[PDB]
């Protein structure tokens, strides 16, 4: 019986929308989070359910599995991964102008084929 760190409604009712939604969870804590409250998308939402999404401050740069220079550590908008902008295949250098995406979604974009 947990709740999301944003509205703190629960995995059956969202106190930010008023809709029932399963709560996500962190790996270092286990804190829940509504993919909607989290600003996720069906992709991020699903992704977090696939692995250990972790709760932001735990969301280490999957690339380094550290989070050290988190000052750059972006958060994918298709899975919610963690990438220090200078770890990315095409290093960001500075927070993307628009929507940023990690390699997982892309790898998924190709592998999705037969």
């Amino acid at each position: 019986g947990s709740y999301c760190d944003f509205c703190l409604g629960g995995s059956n009712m969202n106190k930010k929308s008023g809709r029932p939604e399963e709560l996500v969870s962190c790996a270092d804590c286990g804190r829940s989070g509504h993919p909607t409250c989290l600003q996720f998308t069906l992709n991020m939402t699903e992704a977090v359910k696939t692995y250990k999404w972790q709760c932001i401050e735990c969301k280490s740069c999957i690339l380094c599995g550290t989070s050290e220079n988190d000052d750059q550590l972006l958060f994918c908008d298709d899975c919610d991964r963690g990438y220090h902008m200078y770890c990315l295949n095409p290093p960001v250098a500075e927070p993307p102008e628009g929507s940023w995406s990690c390699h997982l979604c892309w790898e998924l974009l190709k592998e999705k084929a037969s």
Partner: peptide
């Protein structure tokens, strides 16, 4: 994109700063 720092890892509300 929101980085793990000042971006508060959350969509804020825009910022007055036209890209050079």
């Amino acid at each position: 994109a929101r980085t793990k720092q000042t971006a508060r890892k959350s969509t804020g509300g825009k910022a007055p700063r036209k890209q050079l």
